[model samples]
Target: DPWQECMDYAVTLARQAGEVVCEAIKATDQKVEKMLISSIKEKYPSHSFIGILTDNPTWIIDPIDGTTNFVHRFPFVAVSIGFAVNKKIEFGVVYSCVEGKMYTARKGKGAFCNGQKLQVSQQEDITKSLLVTELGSSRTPETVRMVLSNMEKLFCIPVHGIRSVGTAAVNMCLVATGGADAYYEMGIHCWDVAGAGIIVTEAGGVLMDVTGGPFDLMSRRVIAANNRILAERIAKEIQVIPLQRDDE
Candidate 1:
């Protein structure tokens, strides 16, 4: 249960980091990241990945996701932190500062929002599913066209709606908590998914590639759904053309 202890420590650290973020409006992401890195290293003294790269039991964190939202005072930003071993995420925490909602999960346990256990919505029909997507910063003409085209198809089916929460981690938590039925997006980094991905899976959900196989974190594109059937249905429906940009 050492990992469990590490996980608990991680939550406390994240909240501390969250406090620092609240007070330091001028703090740069790198500054806060360095602070968290130093703290985690002090406790675990193990390898880590704060959107960098590493192996072993490591920590992944997005100090303040939804930076743009924060800048706009949109009140949707969060601190996302996670722990993984051998590249498998075992524990995750996504705390929305504005909403004061903390979503957490540990492998083989369960996912939760606040103190309530989470379960995906029972709506299996795509027509009734609420989908979440993002138009990332690395947009190109090709990527835009591909996303818009697929969006049109989804809209044609007239699903509940398509939402863009401006934070990838929060969007994943939305799926994990049944606020949304699925979330798929490209041009994301490991910090974006590493935490929320575990939450989604432990909530009786599924995460896979856009084309319907096991999710490859290295690929940086994923489709997370409430159930296997909806995941496959989405994979079959959306045909995502590869982004031509060399940098994303």
Candidate 2:
């Protein structure tokens, strides 16, 4: 019952919420930026709790993913939603409002972008690679510099430089659709990756804990690649630790 409805509900909810975001984008102004950001944060109250399964099934919504981008009229912004059942991802949706493109996927079912099936890239070696996306968190600049220094060594393979897109959901969507070879981020929230995480895996990529372990819903830090081999390799070079869930 709930399983079959999970996919449709997740998709419908995201599309509807995205529409609201689109409308908001059209009317936003200098004064509206604060209101816009406030609206997003208000939906998921500071202490209020909501889950996609259990007593009351609910959809996680990111009304305006990239507030800064949206504020500046940038097109990289997006909306993300993910559904879980029995603590496992059942389905997820990520919509880029500017392009009006939606990426979706189910647990076992394959991923799709705007209704067309999606597949992750076939990058076999990630030593130093093209299309690597960095996770630009609020971490100290010194720590970020350390990560960059490590990436310079990877350039030995003649790889392209990295880009730090501010949105984690969009970053994961890129990996899921072959737009990126690898994505690494730290200190993100559950709402940030819950949806895109499932899409990436369903699209044939691998999601790994940056600490060289498995990834789960509560995993706040992770590295995603087109496949397991590269995902593991990146994990080895990072000092990230696997986040422990409260349930654990």
Candidate 3:
């Protein structure tokens, strides 16, 4: 009752906000520097949020998750919202503004898309899996090297294919929906995967740190996969690109 209401609200607000913003989508990415704030504030009155210090059923959001993709009409743009209570994320709602795909995951309730249940691909062999990732914001020489070299190794290790739809949220969504077998990346912010990460987990997937440790949303690193074997396999294959943590 507690978190589910919040998740459902997030879904509705995302769908509404998505329509409003995507219709006016020709502007810059700031068009998304934009929705859950006022809407949630009005709905909850005392919910402390990204406007926060903690512990109050907070709402985390990225109004326009795919900045470049939206402007360029790349079909992966989305609105991502995560709800946390007691300092733990209890649910995630990510809506693809352009693609019209709605992804929602409530903790312990499983993950869904457009009301259909979602499950990850159960492929255990890293070689047979399809992989996904992104070239994150900080493109320093070393970071690029790590990102590209990691892909080269994975490709050479012979994953079927690799792809990036330009949005971390949707990329993770693809994993939740079994569209991709695994995804990992560095230099992503909390909002990018905040909502989608839970979606991945609820769909019977695993989320791990870039180094195969426990996943931390604030760490700006993630290895999301269908099962532990693939998760750890990709973890060993990835080169950690350094980035500042969200909480830091």
Candidate 4:
């Protein structure tokens, strides 16, 4: 129940941030750079109290995700947080501020949203389906692009629609909710997908290793999807080995 306390605290911070975004959106025009970085910094001083907790393990959170949507009144923002035990993602919580959609999961526990359980769709039809890929920052755009181009061909889909949501926490939550059939990312920090990964697993989805095995919390380059079938197929076609950022 100690970790549950952490989860409760994390959800608190996330909801607080969500209220901020709702207020900001109702206000006048806001600069993307100024609104995002500055607001996030001011709102989340010291990583939203993550470093302040003296506990052996802690959770990092983002008060509002899809801030751009908030700025535009697009209603896609979320309150996101992830747990780490000695730097391992123990769970994640992502709440869509507008829709009242909340997703949660704990290590070894299943994923859930709004008290009901969630499981990744057991569809192996990538050819007619969708997948999540990250190509926002310059550091890993090439890898994302490489995967998209080849994966589209291998899956026989005309082209994979790459949703550059610019937020790993939200994207991982999407996988948990079945919004995306799968999600693959490289060059992202532990804060991005750690909590959400656990959520996805608990939701009856599979977090496939980059090499088609079970995913480990320490891995940086992750390939999480709805089912094991699609995950393995994509990894094999892309020829990317499963490895973590710390895998030197």
Per-candidate clash tally: 0, 0, 0, 7
TM-score list, all predictions: 0.92, 0.78, 0.94, 0.71
Worst 10 residues of 1 by lDDT: 239-248
Report the lDDT tens digits of candidate 1 across residue range 1-248.
77888878777877776676665543567777888888888877856665634458878789988888878767677789978887688899988777778888999999998879998877789888999988787658877888788888878877888999899999999998898999988777778888899899999899998879998775768888999888888888787667432123
Residue-by-residue lDDT tens digits, candidate 3, 15-108:
9878866787644344444455777888898886661327777777888888788767777789888888887789999999787999999889
Winning candidate number (lDDT): 3
RMSD of each candidate relative to the true structure: 2.4, 5.1, 1.8, 5.8
**lDDT for each residue of candidate 2 in 1-248, tens digit (9 for 90 to 100):** 54565566556656666666667667433333344334435643432233223433434545567777777666777777776655666778888877788999888889999998888888877744544455454467766766666566455444565665667788888888887887876656677777788889889998888777888556567777788888777776666533444234
In the predicted model 1, the residue pairs found to clash are none
Ranking by lDDT: 3, 1, 2, 4
Score candidate 4 by TM-score against the native.
0.71
Q: Candidate 2 — which residues are off by over 4 angstroms?
A: 27-58, 134-143, 147-158, 241-248
Highest TM-score scorer: 3
Report lDDT (CA) for all predictions: 0.82, 0.68, 0.85, 0.63
Candidate 3, superposed: residue stretches over 4 Å from native: 26-34, 51-53
Write the candidate numbers in order of decreasing TM-score: 3, 1, 2, 4
lDDT (Cα) of model 3: 0.85
CA lDDT of 171 in candidate 2? 83
What is the model-wide C-alpha lDDT for candidate 2? 0.68
Which is the better candidate, 1 or 3, if ranked by TM-score?
3
